[PDB]
A paper describes a structure:
Trypanosomes are protozoan parasites that cycle between insect and mammalian hosts and are the causative agent of sleeping sickness. Trypanosomes LSU rRNAs are unique compared to those of other eukaryotes, since they are fragmented and composed of two LSU chains and four small [name] fragments. H69 interacts with the small subunit [name] helix 44 (h44) just below the A-site, forming the ribosomal inter-subunit bridge (bridge 2a). Ψs on the H69 stabilize the helix, enabling the conformational changes of its loop during the dynamic translation process. H69 harbors five Ψs in close proximity whose location is depicted in the 3D [name] of the trypanosomatid [name].
Author numbering:
A (entry chain AS): 2 to 72
B (entry chain AC): 35 to 242
C (entry chain AL): 2 to 123
D (entry chain AV): 2 to 104
E (entry chain Bz): 2 to 34
F (entry chain AP): 42 to 261
G (entry chain AJ): 2 to 130
H (entry chain AR): 3 to 90
The structure:
RNA sequence: UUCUUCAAGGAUACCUUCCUCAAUCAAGAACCAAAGUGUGGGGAUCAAAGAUGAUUAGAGACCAUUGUAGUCCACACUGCAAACCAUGACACCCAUGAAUUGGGGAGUGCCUCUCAGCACGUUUCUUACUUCUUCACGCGAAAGCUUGGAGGUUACAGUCUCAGGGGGGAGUACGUUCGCAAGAGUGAAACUUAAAGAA
RNA sequence: GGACAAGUCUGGUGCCAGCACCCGCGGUAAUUCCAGCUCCAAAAGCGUAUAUUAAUGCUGUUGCUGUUAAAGGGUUCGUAG
């Protein structure tokens, strides 16, 4: 099967390090690009000022107006 | 065959070999299967296989001891789909007292319990393991041992005791059923060993 | 088409089985007998039943029929067929010489009982 | 889904890499030689009615001398073999009959 | 019919569309550089 | 008002056969659910519905709906049986599954995790059972630990009479039909393993159809 | 190529037991193979075996008796301390009532019940039950 | 000395099963192809005695087609089949 | 296609020689269908682009008549294919029956010199491409695989190595290496979606 | 309503207002919205948001997958390992 060495820990460590970048969950916590694009700088809440009140429609199977605001 | 405190009884005699050789019960087919390769003893220049007589008799007696050990003769069923065995099936049942099935085998006669022909035999005898495969397959579902007359090309699945013989040729099957019927009666019954049996093989012969 | 259905066919076999005697190749005599021993409501069925019965009898006069199974005919066939010749065919064959192949003879010599009598190679 | 075990040709793995293509007898399409459907045809130059008239007018074939035949080896693409009814679609479990010789 | 449900037009012609895009982008950056 | 149709049924109707262990010893099929009713007290019956879902088949002008039901039947200790059937109505499918569950009844072995004290509480070995993609593993565990398992394998393992087991699983267990049967196949395998205490060559007895063949001879 | 003759021999034996044979032939055999076999024979798990000698690595004929369920090598040969015996048992054994894990110590090749009695440890070799 | 025993002497196992004489394997309760064959002993005379020798075949051996081969070896060991023809 | 030449390669046979010299691989190297590029030849056939005639609502297409580059050779490039057995290399075990290619061991036909020769029939053996409808066990979601396994695996460990991580954005953008060019290799994210997919 | 313990109760609205973490509910008889009455969980505690651990054998040394679902390099040689 895979490598079974007793002196092959270097190969197994390199394999796991390279392949750990392939899951979106683990990559999001070690890459710093998400925080910059996130309007909250990694914070639970944030404070803002209301600009205007808008009404956005609902997606296709539904039908309504969702009463949002621009902040 | 052997016996505790062996007395050389139940052994092949001179007349038995004459009957077997007379009607060509020792001739196989051109091809052989791996299962039956042990019973074959040499082969002719033509390509026909020769069946070892000693082992043919050994299995014949062993099957007889199984059938005679059944207390109720109705608990033995004899089956045959080939035409040449149908007569031998009938006479064998008459003399020993065993139920018999001839011709087409209705699927369900051993497993479909809510039926007017449901049967529960304790042992099964079939003329040919290849043409009687439906019977063998059905017996594999209800714990029923099987005795079969096998040629050199027979498939031995679901076959417990195999008697190597000549399944083809009208007189060949009749010879084997005649010997089996006589041996069972000798093993237990009113037929003595010294006096030759009075019935005729031609009775077991199949005629139109 | 003039196919006779299962109801007609089955009753005809039953009538022939029970009353094979008194039956003959004449439709009109058979029709009177069928009307006597049947309780069917429809007259049309009784006509067809007697028609198929005559057809069966005509075939029976020439040879056996699979479904008919007459009791007396079976016994006469059984007694004829369970015939025994004066001398067994095997006994005649043993009396004449038995010809066997050389390797067939080879195992016979090796066997304890040895080569039996009335046996020749060729 | 693999429809056929030999993938429609007669080239096992580990045996060849390439087989030279031929032209279809009918549409002139290029098909590998093992994949194509091939038939050897022997046909008479004249049917029964015409052979009788020509034999009567001739002195060579007038007394028991065979007329010439036409020998050709025809190779078909898959489409032209189906359309011309040389072969037909078959039920699953009947797609395995082989017919090693012409009879 | 041999393949299963392409997503949005034959993949070969989608490939040719992008190749002509890359050529035009290359020509546009050469004007400035 | 039940008249048996098989040789085994006739013996069980009388007192010739009294323990299911006699039947299991010769591996004979049951084929009649009244055998289990008589052989078990019927106070330890304990049926249980487990799953009832609809299945459909497309036809011209609509479709056709039927119901598949899974029943589990087990005594207090050592006997378990699972059956599934289909019917045009929910009520019919329930009753049919009950009969099917009784028809297939198997014995399940039990053992000790460590030192042997008192009655057995856990299975004697680790056994796996597979049905589809779902595979269920059962592991022996020290006493006191309960039945560490999902709700579905736990209900089945209660009826089998095990009070202590560790459970691991693989595959798409969201398919409850395969989850029910995979555990049942795991319990059946407990009597197939050859432990070193059974080496112990033992003689051969006679089957009931031979021992009481005389009684079955006369009559119908 | 062939990297472990112990893994090879234990694979041949467990294979023949799966099919139902009565005898196996094993090549090329070595000292470690023979000492492993003697541990299985002494506990009554295989039966009589014999070594045929050529002027090379020999061959072994082993008679079976239908008691073996599985036997296999562990690779690579990990290290086990006298306190680590249980952990191995919980992993590669069907139960703790029966089975064996074969170790190689400085006293010699021997199973884990004997090793615990002498209070030693070493590298695991295989198992059988 | 069959089955599992407590620290006391009580045997807690129920239904000790059958072991096939050919393969040394347990014959389970859901194996419907397993069979039992009874062969009668006889006296120095040709009449049957009244004692039977009994054989157990596993059941998967039958479907493999090896059931016949096993029976030959079992009957030879039990002393019911003469292996080879005697010398003249 | 045949004949004449040059250097190789595998199998078999062997009571020849030698004595661990081996297995598999980042980096690095050589080869690699067709189309395409450069410079000289060659140019019969077919034929991208292009031109005519039809068909059609339209037809830029399919059909017909043509026609340039190409198709062929030499020497330099390119390095991509459904480059497929969609199945990485080395080693072990493993049920049957008929065939076939090459070497070796142990009744029939032709037979004035590549001839103490050549084919065939019967039985064994080593190597190779595989077939079973009268082919196992076993495995798999199934279709199916089964002595180059997709078996011997929750009863999970013979050895090495290359890839994957819900669908799209996308094999795209930026940087860099290689290329005459066409391109090739390496290779993201912001955003957007509850399915897409397999039998 | 389901996952998930707990109403086929009674009024109002009528694809609107709103709920809904996911599947979904609302177009005139709404088991899901706004309310009344009952009931369920846990309780001086209980919801919501963000991050993180277990669930996860969805990072696999123990312990994954690669014919067709994502995935065996086009083929050989070859050094460190
Ligand atoms: K073809
Ligand atoms: K299609
Ligand atoms: K799970
Ligand atoms: K053209
Ligand atoms: K590629
Ligand atoms: K060759
Ligand atoms: K094959
Ligand atoms: K299949
Ligand atoms: K690129
Ligand atoms: K996975
Ligand atoms: Mg080759
Ligand atoms: Mg190719
Ligand atoms: Mg298709
Ligand atoms: Mg695809
Ligand atoms: Mg040529
Ligand atoms: Mg070119
Ligand atoms: Mg050029
Ligand atoms: Mg030029
Ligand atoms: Mg032209
Ligand atoms: Mg797979
Ligand atoms: Mg693994
Ligand atoms: Mg992805
Ligand atoms: Mg939430
Ligand atoms: Mg509603
Ligand atoms: Mg976590
Ligand atoms: Mg490849
Ligand atoms: Mg490459
Ligand atoms: Na391909
Ligand atoms: Na590929
Ligand atoms: Na680039
Ligand atoms: Na499909
Ligand atoms: Na876990
Ligand atoms: Na793929």
């Amino acid at each position: 099967t895979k490598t079974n060495g007793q002196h092959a820990a270097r190969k197994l460590v390199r394999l796991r390090r390279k392949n750990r970048w392939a899951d979106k969950g683990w990559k999001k916590s070690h890459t710093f690009v998400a925080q910059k694009a996130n309007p909250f700088g990694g914070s639970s809440h944030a404070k803002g000022i209301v600009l205007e009140k808008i009404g956005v429609g609902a997606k296709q199977p539904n039908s309504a107006i969702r009463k949002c605001v621009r902040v | 065959t052997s016996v505790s405190s062996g007395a050389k009884v139940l052994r092949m005699k001179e007349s038995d070999v004459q009957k077997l050789l007379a009607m060509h019960c020792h001739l196989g087919t051109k091809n052989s299967s791996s299962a039956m390769k042990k019973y074959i003893h040499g082969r002719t220049s033509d390509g026909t296989n020769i069946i070892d007589i000693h082992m043919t008799w050994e299995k014949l007696i062993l099957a007889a001891r199984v059938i005679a050990a059944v207390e109720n003769p109705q608990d033995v069923t004899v089956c045959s789909t080939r035409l040449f065995g149908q007569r031998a099936i009938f006479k064998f049942s008459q003399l020993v007292g065993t139920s018999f099935l001839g011709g087409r085998f209705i699927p369900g006669t051993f497993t479909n319990q809510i039926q007017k022909k449901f049967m529960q035999p304790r042992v099964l005898v079939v003329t040919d393991p290849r043409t009687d495969h439906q019977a063998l397959r059905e017996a594999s579902l209800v714990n029923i041992p099987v005795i079969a007359f096998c040629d050199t090309d027979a498939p031995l699945e679901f076959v417990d005791i195999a008697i190597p013989c000549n399944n083809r040729g009208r007189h060949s099957i009749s010879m084997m059923y005649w010997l089996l019927a006589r041996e069972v009666l000798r093993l237990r019954g009113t037929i003595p060993r010294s006096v030759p049996w009075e019935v005729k093989v031609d009775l077991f012969f199949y005629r139109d | 088409g003039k196919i006779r259905t299962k109801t007609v066919k089955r009753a005809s076999k039953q009538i022939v089985e029970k009353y094979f005697s008194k039956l003959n190749k004449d439709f009109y005599q058979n029709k009177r007998i069928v009307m006597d021993v049947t309780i069917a409501r429809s007259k049309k069925l009784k006509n067809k039943i007697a028609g198929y019965a005559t057809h069966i009898m005509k075939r029976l006069a020439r040879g056996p029929v699979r479904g008919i199974s007459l009791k007396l005919q079976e016994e006469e066939r059984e007694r004829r067929m369970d015939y025994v010749p004066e001398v067994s065919h095997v006994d005649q064959a043993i009396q004449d010489g038995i010809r066997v192949d050389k390797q067939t003879l080879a195992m016979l010599k090796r066997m304890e009982t040895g080569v039996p009598r009335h046996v020749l190679p060729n | 889904t693999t429809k056929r075990r030999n993938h429609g040709r007669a080239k096992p793995p580990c045996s060849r890499g390439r087989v030279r293509p031929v032209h279809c007898f009918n549409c002139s399409r290029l098909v590998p030689k093992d994949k194509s459907v091939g038939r050897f045809v022997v046909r008479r130059m004249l049917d029964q009615a015409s052979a009788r008239d020509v034999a009567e007018a001739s002195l060579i074939y007038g007394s028991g001398f065979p007329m010439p035949k036409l020998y050709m080896k025809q190779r078909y693409c898959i489409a032209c073999a189906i359309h011309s009814r040389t072969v037909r679609a078959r039920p699953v479990e009947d797609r395995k009959r082989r017919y090693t010789s012409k009879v | 019919g041999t393949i299963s449900r392409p997503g949005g037009m034959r993949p070969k012609w989608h490939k040719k569309r992008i190749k002509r895009l890359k050529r035009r982008r290359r020509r546009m950056r050469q004007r400035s550089k | 008002e039940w008249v048996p149709c098989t040789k085994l049924g006739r013996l069980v109707k009388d007192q010739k056969i009294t323990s299911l262990e006699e039947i299991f010893l010769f591996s004979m099929p049951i084929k009649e659910h009244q055998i289990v009713d008589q052989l078990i007290r019927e106070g330890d019956l304990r049926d249980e519905m487990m799953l009832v879902f609809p299945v459909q088949k497309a036809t011209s002008a609509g479709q056709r709906t039927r119901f598949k039901a899974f029943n589990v039947v087990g005594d207090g200790n050592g006997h378990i049986g699972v059956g599934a059937r289909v019917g045009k109505e929910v009520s019919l499918a329930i009753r049919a599954s009950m009969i099917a569950a009784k028809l297939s009844i198997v014995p399940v072995r039990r053992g000790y995790w460590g030192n042997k004290i008192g009655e057995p509480h856990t299975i004697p070995i680790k056994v796996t059972g597979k049905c589809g993609s779902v595979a269920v593993r059962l592991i022996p565990a020290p006493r006191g630990a309960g039945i560490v398992a999902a709700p579905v394998p736990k209900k089945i393992l209660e009826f089998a009479g095990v009070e202590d087991v560790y459970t691991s699983s693989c595959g798409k267990t969201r398919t409850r039909g395969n989850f029910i049967m995979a555990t049942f196949y795991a319990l059946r395998k407990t009597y197939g393993f050859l432990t070193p205490d059974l080496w112990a060559e033992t003689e051969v007895s006679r089957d009931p159809t031979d021992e009481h063949s005389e009684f079955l001879s006369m009559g119908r | 190529t062939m990297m472990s003759v112990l893994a090879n021999a234990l694979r041949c034996i467990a294979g023949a037991e799966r099919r139902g044979k009565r005898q196996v032939l094993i090549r090329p055999s070595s000292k470690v193979v023979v000492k492993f076999l003697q541990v299985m024979q002494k506990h009554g798990y295989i039966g009589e075996f014999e070594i045929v000698d050529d002027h090379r690595a020999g061959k072994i004929v082993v008679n079976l008796n239908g008691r073996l369920n599985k036997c296999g090598a562990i690779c690579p040969r990990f290290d086990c301390t006298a306190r680590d015996f249980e952990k191995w048992v919980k992993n590669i054994l069907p139960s703790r009532q029966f089975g064996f894990v074969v170790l190689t110590t400085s006293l010699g090749i021997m199973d884990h019940e004997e090793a615990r009695a002498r209070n030693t440890g070493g590298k695991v070799l295989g198992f059988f039950y | 000395t069959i089955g599992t025993y407590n620290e006391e002497g009580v045997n807690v196992d129920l239904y000790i099963p059958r072991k096939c004489h050919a393969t040394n394997s347990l014959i389970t309760s859901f194996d419907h192809s397993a069979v039992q064959i009874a062969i009668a002993n006889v006296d120095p005379n040709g009449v049957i005695d009244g004692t039977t020798t009994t054989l157990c075949i596993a059941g998967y051996l039958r479907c493999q087609g090896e059931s016949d081969h096993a029976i030959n070896h079992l009957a030879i060991a039990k002393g019911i089949v003469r292996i080879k023809t005697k010398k003249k």
